[PDB]
Amino acid sequence: PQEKNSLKDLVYQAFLRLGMEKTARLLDALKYYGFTFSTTSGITIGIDDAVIPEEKKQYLEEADRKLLQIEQAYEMGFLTDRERYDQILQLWTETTEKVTQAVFKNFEENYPFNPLYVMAQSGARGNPQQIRQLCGLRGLMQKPSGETFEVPVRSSFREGLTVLEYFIS
Amino acid sequence: TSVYIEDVLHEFSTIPGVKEDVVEIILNLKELVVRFLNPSLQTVTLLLKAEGPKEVKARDFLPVADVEIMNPDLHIATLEEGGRLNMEVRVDRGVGYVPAEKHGI
Amino acid sequence: ARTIRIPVHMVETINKLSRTARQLQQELGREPTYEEIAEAMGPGWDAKRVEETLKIAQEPVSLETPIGDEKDSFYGDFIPDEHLP
Amino acid sequence: AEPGIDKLFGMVDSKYRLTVVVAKRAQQLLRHGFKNTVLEPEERPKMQTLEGLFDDPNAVTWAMKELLTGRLVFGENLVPEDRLQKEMERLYPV
């Protein structure tokens, strides 16, 4: 499939073999057909296009269970205050990455022509980090001092943030 | 295509005894539907002379031969006691959308 | 004290006019008009002379006066040269 | 892109030499009213005007197309500047 990198390599190869004048004509041809097909393709953005994977609920419940494990070990003296803080951040960092993989795995196997997935894969608009905030969770937030809040933003932009989460972000 | 109102110089004014300003009256006149019963008729002028208190409608224009108002109940202006509305509305025949800045009639 | 020098006889005239206007303001509770100032000055004074004297007393404005909240725009940037063709 | 821009760049060692040659030729063409052109009458650049097809007024367009034909000679220290101007006026009094 013709994406940003393959089209860029095509333009560079045409420049080497054919010169500026022919490359400029090729660029206008790509622009014309790219605009023509994007209009008739049926590319739009609905709220359901931000598909929520079913693994997000599993990961959040799993993260909550391991969050209790950290707090249980905190009360037993096995780990210090800074150890508890680092353990929570690592747990949510790993959970955030798994949700990102679940979002794109859900698109890859079930909605290969999903608008957000197609824009991100083709290089038109968006990156996996921004797609995760729309379909997964926004994740950990930082205080103005630079310290990370212990509780992440568990909601995506589809579900809608709470008042506190919006202020934390 | 053009409207003349007595004692009115431009469309950015208000008329004493009339609730609507000239802009709103022109907006109401843009919804006037006029049917020419004569295929050779190209331009007609409709005369309206009203005195308050009344709700002047499209049926209050003076009758013109080979001219029929298709929406007589169209609201034009609201006249208060002591208010008068003497209008000369010109209706032309044409195609497409011609902004006033182009024809300038 | 003035970039455009004014003779002492006219400086004292400006000082007297300013004092007279100040005293009339406290009596009237408002800015006096040129006729009211001229009447208080005495004989030989009309509103035309008061206006001319006040026009004379106007100090020149600086070309480097800032315009806006940033010191990047000045009065001289908006004055066209009208001498060179 | 300008017509034959790849060929124009290939005829000079430095791309800015091409601009100097084109600009100097254009002023030669403007100075003599395009009477010093090396273009054949069927090769003259044309303007589509409401009054008909006329010659292209842009001398830069003329200069670029003249260089594509190969009938122009460019270089450094080809002829003295004074002798070049005087001789070209003799051939094209304009």
Place this chain on the structure above:
Amino acid sequence: PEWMILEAVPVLPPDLRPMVQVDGGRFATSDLNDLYRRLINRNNRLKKLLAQGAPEIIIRNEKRMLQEAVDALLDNGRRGAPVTNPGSDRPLRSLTDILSGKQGRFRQNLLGK
């Protein structure tokens, strides 16, 4: 090396420090004229003080004021409190200020136009 001390102070041409009447009727002038007037007033007063045989304390104060007037004309605010026109706290734009900075002559009128 003694040329680093000024005996004659150059005066900028008047069109580069214009006094112009605006369309309204009021006059507009550059800060350099006020800086020049202060130097001339202090220099002229020193000449009269010297002619009157004033005590050294008065002469010393005038000479120190003359040095500061020259400094304000060349570089206002470089040494001591910046010189400002009456009725405002704006420092007068000196010759150094005109040439230096982002609003100076180099970066506002020579490197870009």
Place this chain on the structure above:
Amino acid sequence: MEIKRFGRIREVIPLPPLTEIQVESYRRALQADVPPEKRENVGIQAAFRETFPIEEEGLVLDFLEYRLGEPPFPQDECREKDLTYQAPLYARLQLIHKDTGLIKEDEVFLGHIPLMTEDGSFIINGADRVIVSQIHRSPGVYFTPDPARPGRYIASIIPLPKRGPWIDLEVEPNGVVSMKVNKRKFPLVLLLRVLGYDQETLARELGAYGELVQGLMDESVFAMRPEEALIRLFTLLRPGDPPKRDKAVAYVYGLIADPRRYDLGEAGRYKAEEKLGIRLSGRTLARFEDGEFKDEVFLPTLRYLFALTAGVPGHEVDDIDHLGNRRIRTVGELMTDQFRVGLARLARGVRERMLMGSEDSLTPAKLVNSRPLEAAIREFFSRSQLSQFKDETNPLSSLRHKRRISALGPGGLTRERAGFDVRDVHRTHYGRICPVETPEGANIGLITSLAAYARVDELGFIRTPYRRVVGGVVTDEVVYMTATEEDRYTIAQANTPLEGNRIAAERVVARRKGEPVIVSPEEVEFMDVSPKQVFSVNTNLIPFLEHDDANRALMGSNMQTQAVPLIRAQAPVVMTGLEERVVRDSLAALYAEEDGEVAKVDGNRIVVRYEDGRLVEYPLRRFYRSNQGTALDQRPRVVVGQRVRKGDLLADGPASENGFLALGQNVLVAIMPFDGYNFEDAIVISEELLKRDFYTSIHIERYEIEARDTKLGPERITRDIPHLSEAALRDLDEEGVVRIGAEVKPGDILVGRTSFKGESEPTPEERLLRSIFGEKARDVKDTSLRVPPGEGGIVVRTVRLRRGDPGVELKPGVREVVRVYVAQKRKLQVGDKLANRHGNKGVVAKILPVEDMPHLPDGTPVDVILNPLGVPSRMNLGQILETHLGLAGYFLGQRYISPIFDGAKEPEIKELLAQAFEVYFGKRKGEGFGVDKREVEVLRRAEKLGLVTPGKTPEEQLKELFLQGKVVLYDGRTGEPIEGPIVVGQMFIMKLYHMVEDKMHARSTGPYSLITQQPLGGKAQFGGQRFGEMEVWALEAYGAAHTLQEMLTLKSDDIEGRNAAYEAIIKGEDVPEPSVPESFRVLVKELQALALDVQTLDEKDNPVDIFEGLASK
């Protein structure tokens, strides 16, 4: 059209008056209505009581009372005549002869106090202005840790701004505590000796904190008396100054003990007592009584500093960005502060007049010169950074401006001193300052907005309301409480589930000192009133705010301020519930004072017969020009004989629809790329918008000209302009002014003016030319006012103010001034900026005919085409949800109120879409139409994309697409359907004040600068574009040497070159070789003025003259 309201949170209290930050503070400062004997010691009353009595000593000028008179002119007349809406100020002053014992009392006129209008603004020189509230560090005593020395703390004593020096107490590494005053560091031990402290006393009070008291032990200064230490202290503070006792005591008294010179402030005094656990008698660091200095705050400050350094419990450092440590100076305090400064200047002039003498016939009127007070007040309302030209593009614009909070301004911060700490959203901004509304760019975090429910208290601290929670049940008791008081409680979120008034959820999301925690209901002590208190008014107008990224929500809230009023302005289909309150609190609309019946309705005025029987006539503001040029008019919304209740709408104001805020239009939007005209935020609209006059706005431009007295003769405003034909003078009346109702185009004359030509002999070519034609040159020339390029319209108003007119204060030498108002009706065109409330903005790049737009199967074309590529990166999903809800409301014929964070959710939007489908598609079935062949093809692709369930009927699959907000959409160009279903819905889009009509500019040649001889700048001055250094860099990188040289010389400041270039071009010739720029000649001459010999040399080092021999003697 019904309005369906979403939301579960019940707001116990309504929004406070949105302008009370302006209105209440200025009323408190003026105290105009309270009788003088009951005036409290605040505002300008406090200013009088602080400066008076002016005891020169023996004449004493005492202040008894002041009063404010009625304004000389009404608000409308002040605007027309460029007058300040102000009230005369009179002070009843008494002069007391201490020797004779005689009192002379009279009322002196102190000048004019500008008056705030009802909406909360001022009219300064005929212009509407808003005084922006200022945020700064609150006065008091603060304890911050030393960054250089770990474990060490410094004590800061901050008074009111420009009301005393900052005091720093620090334990030096050697041990002695140092006091830093006016950049001078001296040992604090010496000061306490002056303030009467013994060695035993210091050991008793502060000897219980380690050995730190040992550093507060200098045997040299305890040996000397307090009077000797006072002189010793005076020498350190003012070295060289003769240390006389009377001079020394006056300096120390004026440094820490003079109320007229040191003022800790009511907020500062309160903060000092709360932190140090003491009780201040006044607002000074010390008190001078019985000929000696008594300490008031230094001992508690040093005691806390040692206790904090010793690590004792209960002592903590102070967060200076904590909003309990940052206060707001409102318009009342800012005006009062400048009023005090002017009064101090007036008091100083009273003393010198008392020094002059003539006490035999001295009256208080003679001693008082009000000009220093008037000048200070005039300077504050005219040339202050916080005094700003009122933004009134739409009524919401003025509301936001009056709630703006600025960290800049006099006594404020600068962007150089503004680090990340001041600009960040502190945790205490919650409920007090909006975490979203801020200007993006260099001013981010420096200008903010008051939160919707927030209010500034008497001390200047922002308080936010909370609901008291006791025993796990939420009461209706609302407590407005500061950030420092908020830190003491566990405050639950407003979304916490409630069973009646009792908290139903076992786990409650709460905040403890700003941190999110999960607590039991019994641990909850307060509750948030509503989600709306977190955000400002503009942010609260963004529906589905919870679905938008904060960076794009910032853009949406800011651009609502830029929306122009529309002649057919509509309230949004999806609202948040604050649209009515914004219009009501802006005072732009008209409402019935009480119950009554409307007697007369007209476009000019409304007369209502109230129940009590009195006739009240309300004149309607019609076609008024705002500060930004947008037309502000009030259109009546009642008929004659209609009964109105108290508060019922009488006339809609600008940008309002039936009392609801109407900043734009409701248009049918298709979210889909369209042939590259949607590229990079560009917007495609239909021509049908122009046909029905949506996004059509009225703009009024003001043109001014003055007829002046000139030495060669006065300028005459007349119709007789020399050398002009009848065509050019056709629209001018006999007075020379353009007639009302005339259409004016660029180059047309608005008003004719002739000016006497300066005496100068003509060029000989002109002398021969005039002689051939036999025409004698006239004495006057054309100086008439003409329409600038790219402007024009319809003349609607001409204002002529003449010298001697009542209230017209023309400048000397000006005989008359003529002002012409030109109104233009602006339709939407290519280049005009459109935006929605979610930060999606773009310019119209293409206007299509109706038959080219995508259309529904029922034939309805969409109005606006938006690129779906603008959504994913911006992460503002609220527009999509608005589009889905708008699609349901478009077919159900209803509007929606979805409050932010508590409103319409996806399940409830979809069930609205299910009902909207039954009228969307069920109407088709009744008309005798099945499923389109084109729809069947799209449904076939839809199931391959996983959008519809395979095996269902086409009707069911179309319903499934509809529940996702998508419809089958047909291409108007081809008739074939778009291969995939397209999100189509109704969305509220605003037309912004940035219009290509006002921004397009071009210049070939024009005015040049006086000194540099370079083209001026700005479209208004017909200036040229700035070719700065970076643009010069670009040409250098291109190797375009000759292009660069032209811009440097031929097109900017080569006077000979630019004249020869223009002459060559108009002759058909090529421009000549450029020459030296005139700015380089200026540079050389200015370098010579610095006594620098700058010379241009040739190949042979010989001097080269670039001045053409014009400067060589």
Place this chain on the structure above:
DNA sequence: CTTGACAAAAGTGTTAAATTGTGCTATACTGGGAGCCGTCACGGATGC
């Protein structure tokens, strides 16, 4: 082509009022005034 003739138009020498510059006020008076410090790192010098 000159040559008179005119009524200005322009130059010019007085004379007056208007304007401008200068001196002078005699109880005794004897060291100012406004500020008043929320940024940062960078050289470079200037001395402990």
